[PDB]
Amino acid sequence: GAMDPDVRCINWFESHGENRFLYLKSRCRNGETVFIRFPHYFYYVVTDEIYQSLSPPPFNARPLGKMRTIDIDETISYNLDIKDRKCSVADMWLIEEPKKRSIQNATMDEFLNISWFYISNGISPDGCYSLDEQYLTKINNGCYHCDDPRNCFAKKIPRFDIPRSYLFLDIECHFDKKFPSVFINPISHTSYCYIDLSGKRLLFTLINEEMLTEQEIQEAVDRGCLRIQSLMEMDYERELVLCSEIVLLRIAKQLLELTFDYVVTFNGHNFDLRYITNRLELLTGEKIIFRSPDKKEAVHLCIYERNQSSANTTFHVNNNNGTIFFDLYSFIQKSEKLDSYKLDSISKNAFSCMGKVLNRGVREMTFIGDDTTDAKGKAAAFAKVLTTGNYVTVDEDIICKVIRKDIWENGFKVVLLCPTLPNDTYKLSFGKDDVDLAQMYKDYNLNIALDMARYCIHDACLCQYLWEYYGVETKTDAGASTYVLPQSMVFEYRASTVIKGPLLKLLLETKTILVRSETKQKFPYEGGKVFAPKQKMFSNNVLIFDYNSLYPNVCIFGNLSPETLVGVVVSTNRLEEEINNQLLLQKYPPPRYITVHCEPRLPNLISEIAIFDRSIEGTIPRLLRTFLAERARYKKMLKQATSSTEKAIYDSMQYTYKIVANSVYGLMGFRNSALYSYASAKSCTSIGRRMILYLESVLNGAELSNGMLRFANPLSNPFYMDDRDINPIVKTSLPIDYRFRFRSVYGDTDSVFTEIDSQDVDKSIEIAKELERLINNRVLFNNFKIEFEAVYKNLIMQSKKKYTTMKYSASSNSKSVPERINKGTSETRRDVSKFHKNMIKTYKTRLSEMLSEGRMNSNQVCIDILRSLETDLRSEFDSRSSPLELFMLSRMHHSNYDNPNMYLVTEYNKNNPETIELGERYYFAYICPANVPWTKKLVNIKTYETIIDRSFKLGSDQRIFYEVYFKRLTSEIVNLLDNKVLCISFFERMFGSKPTFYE
């Protein structure tokens, strides 16, 4: 009977016909669903003079107030004769039009119609409301129309929780050597995970019969599978169903046409759904059809693309029914920087626990995880993935099938098919998987079909596990709130599109319009500025300080905005440069104006100086000021809340305000952006770079003696003359006995690393906290702050991307467990041999001790540790006392896409009593004839790969091919070294080749 008028908006979407509409999908507190339809207008902003002139009048119009319109075109000047920036005031109108309309000098055209809908009717995209039924007329069951949303939506109310329905899916298509093509390859599986409004999970997988034997099909039935002959016969409470391809496909079409809230895949948009759809057209005639909630519009499922250069392409579904088709692969690429975007890597990082041993021996380890084993609920998360996980990875490398599992709400007990090395504790991960589909299809039979079923369901369920892990539901809503956009458009549109809502709201609040009256000349700002450590290896501890949101703070500090730019003064010679600099300082003094040297924009210019007026807060800085404030609010809300559902919501909001603030720098330099401003962007970079150098100049060589911190240079404000005490000698609250010395060791865009001559992590943290305080009170000024993050012990670092250290955090003390930090690496467990590991471990421990002596050039360390390598190496090549064991390496056998490895294992199987089986882990070594001498050439070191089985004995007329191991080893050693020229001379002489340095 009666509609619940209490609704929570969950998506918004549009139909596109000649007769088009905007639709809302909302969820009521009971659980019912209400679609509401609204007429589509196109919005235009005009000046009052244009308004009065209009051919026929607009359908509707609301006044906007007086608004300043400002010319933000950027001009350079070769002297100080800088014309004032053009500026007019006028009453403005927001006009509505049911047809598209060309209005000769309409303004604010960059902003989106949908944004105007929300702003103009006072509707928040994710709001809860008590609808005013007076303004709704029903039209289907469940679908109402609303001519007056401003009044209908007038009673906003607080957020109530709602249930939501999900379908997560994955498919498996047959193939042998080429990538599966819809014209030739059938779908072999379709797996589905349905989460109901109740929270109940339903799992079901359809298996393609036509790829099995009539006997096999009957075995499946006997074994407990259901077999069905048509769509009508499907029973969704059956986890395993066999049917024909056409049935399977008709079943997908039925599911995909349903109005789930979310349909969720990993690369489903470009692969899985494309394949289902095309394969369905092929085998029957049929389309997958979506309909608007009032049945007025019907579209056939058609995947479309969106492009965005700096770059990758994303794929999207064109459903007009309110369902959010969400591809985690696109999303994870937009929201994270990672080395791999393969599902196995993404799973490895996201889902891991610490596993305490319960049994050893046979070919079966066993572990337990719980609150007592890692951290509160880390095992609960792991247990939830295990419900369908088939392969756990142990200790980073040992992939091993599950055998049994016990699961409860907080822990798991799992038994696995691995080797043995039983330390009391080990790390468990759901990552890589030693499965060769191409082989599986080649030998396909019932048991393999069931194995794939188990794999396919797990990939579908990984989509729900990842969806919980990345918090996509709340990120979507936070996105919608903040960007003033439909939930479904939040992770579809790009960074330049999403900034526009909040920007528009600000332009309205500040009664300001920004107009570029010219074609933008071409230049971005980037000059690829990359940062290299003063040295790689650290004997002493290293202090880590982060600037707090440097670039947003730079823009605020300088009042950097396209309209606060007074002008840009350039010079081609030193006389003009000097004259201009002295006129600058008279005409645009501080502190009202800041003047910023930038990298000049033309090759003939020796100087370029952007001048900003800080008297009236500019658009961009105020935007950022809002974003930072809102983030702070939410971080506090996140700690004042206690319900974990609320924590998730406030964490997402907080995150969204981080992301959007961080988008602003790039957007200032991107020419298709509403925030583009060459000078502002360049100036932001320049001011930031200067803050880094200032902080570094001050700490580099700074010392702490008595209770005084002697900074290495005065505390002078680098941009202009200042109120503050520049005295670099500064009272500290540290112990008088402390005597320490500091070195600026690395620094980048937003971070600064300070070596301290001490290994005492307890004291290193005590001092750093005090450095933090003095840096913020005396060194820095206005809104520039750092924060002490952590101490890094045994830092070895190569870049910001590739580094290794033990990290004792700010919270930390001397004796808590560090955090092993690895980054950018590729090795361990049989990429590299025990001879290499044992040598690297030795050559490090000796090098760290050479740095604690203090008695070094670059070259007195370097000569000494390279002499020592020639000695140890020539010794091993002559004395040859090291077991063959020490040079063995591993690998997994599998089929192709690898190629000369198949020839390697084949020939071993073809010539030897044993067979290395197709999912087996086999040892190898670099072996050559003993009559080969020291070799400075090289070749296909693949020829010398020799499978070492259990029988194998080294020929009397064979040797370990030491060179291969040595070259790889001196490589790792010369990248520990700072003297580069010495290292290359060694490597050419010893190996006839030129070494790689990780640049």
Author numbering: -3 to 306, 314 to 900, 904 to 1005
Task: Give passages from the manuscript.
The enzyme is a member of the DNA polymerase family B15 possessing DNA polymerase and 3′−5′ proofreading exonuclease activities. E9 alone was shown to be distributive under physiological conditions (adding fewer than 10 nucleotides per binding event) unless bound to its heterodimeric cofactor D4/A2012.
Here we present the 2.7 Å crystal structure of the full-length VACV DNA polymerase and the characterization of the interface between E9 and its processivity factor subunit A20. The structure was solved at 2.7 Å resolution using the MIRAS method. We observed the classical palm, thumb, finger, exonuclease, and N-terminal domains of a family B polymerase in an open conformation. Only 10 out of the 1006 residues could not be modeled. Insert 2 (aa 356–432) is located on the back of E9 in the exonuclease domain and forms a little 6-stranded β-barrel with a greek key fold. The helix of insert 3 forms an important contact as it is bound in a hydrophobic cavity of a symmetry-related molecule mainly comprising residues of the exonuclease domain (i.e., residues 190–200 and 227–233). Still, for E9 electron density is visible for all the C-terminal residues.
